[PDB]
Design a protein around this ligand. Sequence first.
Ligand SMILES: NC(=O)c1ccccc1N1CCCCC1
Length: 284
Amino acid sequence: MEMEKEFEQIDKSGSWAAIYQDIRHEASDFPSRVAKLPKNKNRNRYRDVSPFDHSRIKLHQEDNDYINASLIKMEEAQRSYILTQGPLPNTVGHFWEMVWEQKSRGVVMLNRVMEKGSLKCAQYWPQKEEKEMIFEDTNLKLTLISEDIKSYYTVRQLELENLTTQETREILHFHYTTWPDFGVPESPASFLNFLFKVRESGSLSPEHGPVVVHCSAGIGRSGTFCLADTCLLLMDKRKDPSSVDIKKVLLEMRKFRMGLIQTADQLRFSYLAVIEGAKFIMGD
Ligand SMILES: NC(=O)c1ccccc1N1CCCCC1
């Protein structure tokens, strides 16, 4: 069923809360035993948001390999994503160790450091060129190279140095700065423009490690970003673009991380983004 007609049918019937609970009921439940070990309590932002054991990213260290991060591998679309929480005061060094070890080119940030008067993630990148950061625990140095501030997003060029080997890499930081403190954006135009800027950079392409995507918990806004990207790529690849079922794609992605799309409003917004984005994919 053409999702645009499914959309109007749910809107006119006002059944978004009903569709959303059906997804919550059918979603996968896999163990997260490593996340719940007592040694890892200060590595988790939220007691109720944990990576599954089968899909968790492992740090390359014998001491403690744990980070709250999941590998989402979309087989038919040929896209992979790492979804992670906003870094905590004790996990900024682990965060950049993961970027280094997984060979990522891009980091996508969908939250502000402060929202609703509370801290949603640590200031984990340098704000001035002349004031770089050194993570002693993971032996990494991070330098701000350049910053391009736009009305709806900021793009930063960062240099990450492995102080052990003196290898360096360029990382691109894509920061969506205008998601409202409550609810979802009224139009998906700025969010789709932002998704197309990340794609244009090479950060989502198979010559690099997976993109790192985060918000505060790494499931809600982060879920909307990967769901919209994957659905648009499948509409490009398939003979019948109307065969793309957003609910089935979301349940596939929930095999790899719990709780993706946190509200019925985020589910409606994901449908709107895919419907409006398809009007480019199909030749406009
Ligand atoms: N070890 C670090 O993470 C670190 C290193 C250099 C400068 C700042 C740093 N952080 C920033 C956000 C979390 C608290 C402290």
